[PDB]
Design a protein around this ligand. Sequence first.
Ligand code: SF4
Ligand code: SF4
Ligand code: FES
Lengths: 117, 208, 93, 112, 118, 176, 112, 96
Amino acid sequence: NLIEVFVDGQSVMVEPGTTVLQACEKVGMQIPRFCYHERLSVAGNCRMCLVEIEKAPKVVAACAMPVMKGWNILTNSEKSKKAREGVMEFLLANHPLDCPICDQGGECDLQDQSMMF
Amino acid sequence: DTRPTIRPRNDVVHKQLSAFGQYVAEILPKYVQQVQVSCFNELEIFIHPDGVIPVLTFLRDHTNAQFKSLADLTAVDVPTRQNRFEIVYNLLSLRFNSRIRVKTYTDELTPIESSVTVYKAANWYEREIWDMFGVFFANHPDLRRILTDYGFEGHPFRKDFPLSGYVELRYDDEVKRVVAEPVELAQEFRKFDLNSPWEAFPAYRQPP
Amino acid sequence: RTSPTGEKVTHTGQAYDDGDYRRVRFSDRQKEVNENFAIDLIAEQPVSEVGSRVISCDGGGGALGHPRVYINLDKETKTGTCGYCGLQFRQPH
Amino acid sequence: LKKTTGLVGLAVCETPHERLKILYTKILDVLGQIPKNAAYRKYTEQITNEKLGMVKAEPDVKKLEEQLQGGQIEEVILQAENELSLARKMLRWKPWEPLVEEPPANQWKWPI
Amino acid sequence: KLDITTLTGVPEEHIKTRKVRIFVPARNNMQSGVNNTKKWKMEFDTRERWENPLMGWSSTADPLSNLVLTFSTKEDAVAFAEKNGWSFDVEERKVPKPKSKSYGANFSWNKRTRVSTK
Amino acid sequence: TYKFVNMREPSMDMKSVTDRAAQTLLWTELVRGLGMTLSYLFREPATINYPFEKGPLSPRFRGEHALRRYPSGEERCIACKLCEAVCPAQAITIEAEPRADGSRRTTRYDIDMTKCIYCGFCQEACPVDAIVEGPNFEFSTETHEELLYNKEKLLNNGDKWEAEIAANIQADYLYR
Amino acid sequence: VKPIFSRDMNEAKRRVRELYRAWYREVPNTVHLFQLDISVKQGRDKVREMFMKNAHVTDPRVVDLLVIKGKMELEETINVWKQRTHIMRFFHETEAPRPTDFLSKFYVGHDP
Amino acid sequence: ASATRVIQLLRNWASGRDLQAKLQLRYQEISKRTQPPPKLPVGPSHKLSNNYYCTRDGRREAMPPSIVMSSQKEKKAVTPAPPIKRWELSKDQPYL
Ligand code: SF4
Ligand code: SF4
Ligand code: FES
């Protein structure tokens, strides 16, 4: 029953219904995410999980979009990088400069994801 | 890419180093196990530990490889490998204005041939390697502690050796001498966990 | 303030107890105590009244202050307090 | 005649061409002892033949030095001596043999 | 069995009394990254950390208090502990089970999964 | 590209040999050196009259650490503890608790100057310009315990040197 | 595996005995040289104690390296490279004896 | 320097050089310690457009070392690099 999808050109077998983010986790790629939680219902609002699929005009939400057989998930493509950068810019646009006084400082997903993506 | 932030990379030296690495591998298939050129144009030859003297002698005397200067001989302790200690030889060829690295592996017990015959500078470097890491060098003219204290026990640079050590010194009036006592720190060295939970470099990702 | 033992209490609420042997360290030497309690000093500072719903405080002096933070004044009973400076701002009633 | 080689411990050779020819012949013989398949023999014979041909062709010491691109002719003589000694040591070592042993598992894996 | 204990130089007290724990570090619940939880690590038992009388700074005599060694595989850590003669306790790596996730289930027709708010 | 130091053949001209022998016998070069030192004797000495005269110093000078305050009088330190992290000698020990008001105010800011390397990373890291190395280099003590500076000591140092510290920061903040 | 010096344990024991003889004969001189307050018996007792500490070793390679380290300490002692304190460091004196009885350890502290 | 002309002449003669021209002590050629407030410039990436970090992330453009040869599964002689060219004697001052 497993469909053959590709992550960055690497073939990976996934059960039908697997989200793009889960397949990327299978190959070892942790797509940046803020709203998606493994034990919480999929939301798709943060828009930080956007990733490019080969031969696809629009980036898809890896946290929600289920994989389709034959899809090549370009996790580190320019489209994906720019999408992540733009979404992080939007997230930080109104975020207060509270890092020195924020207890989450040093262990903030926002901080690390901004620093990495 | 381009722009000042990115470091300019010279491909010509990369090609030259790759060609010379293949040259060395062909000349010495008995010992050369792997040849790598880093993206910053640094040729590295991995050699079986038995080939320390032959490979270095070739890289020193050969007309087309005149690496007659031992820049630095060091060791890297990786405890996750059976041969934890990795002996690295950094060489320099003035004739061809190039550098090369010979990397070999060794255990805590397996001896490694001394390269003093090849390079006289190897004496003190190998003494340091033995003193800090504990890699015994066979046929060494004088292998002894060079940097630690005379009565010191243990090899400090080993990854399993504590940073503060096991013993400390102080002067005791009763014995009228400097005595060694078990280490007691007034303030423990505060270990800081800094590694981020998010991957930083996708290019160097190890597949599960 | 001064403890019952006679040892001045620091702004960190620290005062060697009577049973504390460490009190001997001040036998012939003074106990360094700062005499400008910060908490009292800001309490002196008046509460500014700014009509705008949201105000920003940099601590004064621009680059010589603290990272600019925007404070909301919707709460009527409470007064918006600077995260770094501690200055209180209010919206005129 | 060159007064001094500049390098301390290196002396000017009055007959550099003859010395180089003799050394190159010795080197070529030692390489001939080496098995033909060995890459060392092939490459070293190529290099020595080039240098010997240039040495015989050019009688002027300075022009020969420029031609060989090995520095001063005394330095080239030293290089030839080193190569000859290396060739003998190679005959002893036989590095043209197959690999002694493959590296154990991931002995060359970085990062861990 | 390689016996490097005599060559390590570790005092006998810190060769026998020590209780090495081989484990994979757990993911900090505050963050969602898993890069830290990818390599086996070896740590020693925690011991007394009293207070320095002069300043109140925490003092310790444990020389191996801060020693943490990362290992590619569990077998590597086990072998390293055996070489150094340290009693080692191994905790098997806990990998989160794959979880089926459906955005459509949030809008189910006759299932509890239907979300009340978005 | 390369210059030959020494590498100068001596001329064997009888005049040149005569002058060389004159140098050897009459000790000419020794007299030349002696005259050079005599010239140094009549120069003006470069000694400053310490402590009545102090040596030149720049506003960026790094010295005794000091904790600063906002103009209102509140401690700038908001207990981010990043100066503790950046400190390459692990000299800063910071413990903080919510103050009675509710702000991030440290209950312990201890730096042992006997372990600090006076690098200045602490002042470069502080996001509120609280910990700033002052201009005082003359703070030698007679007992080791004195070097270990408490939070109270740092606050007092800040209060004492605030004028100069503020002036120097005002004179250097643009460069930073 | 290549042996460090001794192929067999019997060969290693030969090296151990050779080292023990040298240490045994050096102890009287060492007391004279460093003007130690220990007796010749005390030093020789310590030598035997140190040798007996590593008496559980079974690998000839490890025994070889232990002998090499033992030689190095002897070389420093003979060459007066060590100082008086260095020689006395073997005789732990200032260090307070740590008890072995569980009840004593229970009183002393949280020692595991 | 505040020295008498006689002292200056004696000093220069003993040294053999005009020391007053280059006196080691600094008097007034020193720059004023108080300086005008500076305005340091911005870097090449201080722009509001075409500034995506993906186009300037040199740290993430590094690649693992290329494996030229691995033992695990007529050529001309090759030197590590072209031989170094002989240095040329200085023209300002060939022999010190
Ligand atoms: S860096 Fe500044 S604000 Fe942060 S703890 Fe240190 S002194 Fe306080
Ligand atoms: S100046 Fe350097 S040594 Fe001193 S407290 Fe700051 S970081 Fe530590
Ligand atoms: S993780 Fe929120 S949109 Fe994908």
